[PDB]
């Protein structure tokens with residue numbers, strides 16, 4: 380459980396993300412694919428993009444980034460009351476895409492990295508700790524939903 384103050388820090392930095400969702404999404408996906416090349420293999424339409432510039436020029440990848448961050452933002456804004464938002468995400472990611480919790484850790488790292496890179500003045504230690512807790516809660520709850528669906532990833 381996050382404190383009200385922790386949620387406020389999470390949502391404060393998220394408002395900064397929302398000033399350019401597309402750009403944040405590109406940086407996050409690119410960081411993810413570069414830091415953990417195995418994750419790129421899950422995306423048939425992307426794993427052929429060979430360089431960072433190619434990734435940045437891909438409208439498909441940019442649109443996907445906005446899809447991912449929009450879903451995450453919707454979850455974060457519920458401040459933990461996110462069953463209705465999390466369930467469909469668990470369903471597709473457990474049963475169709477097959478994304479282990481370890482990969483969710485990978486993208487969480489990429490999110491923290493990009494948020495710090497772009498907003499250091501609004502993403503100090505306390506804000507990072509709050510965001511870390513929010514993403515930890517997200518991963519914990521989605522892991523339980525994964526198991527309900529029979530997926531042990």
Ligand code: HEM
Pocket residue numbers: 418419421422424446447448450451467468471472476478482483486
């Ligand atoms: C913050 C964590 C994440 C959020 C909020 C998220 C959200 C989404 C959304 C909204 C979609 C489109 C609808 C759907 O299929 O559910 C999607 C599709 C997809 N995702 Fe995620 N995702 C996350 C983490 C990951 C990770 C780490 C990977 C592994 C590289 C991944 C692999 C995929 C794949 C392979 C598709 C299919 C779309 C297509 O076939 O073009 N996701 N995700």
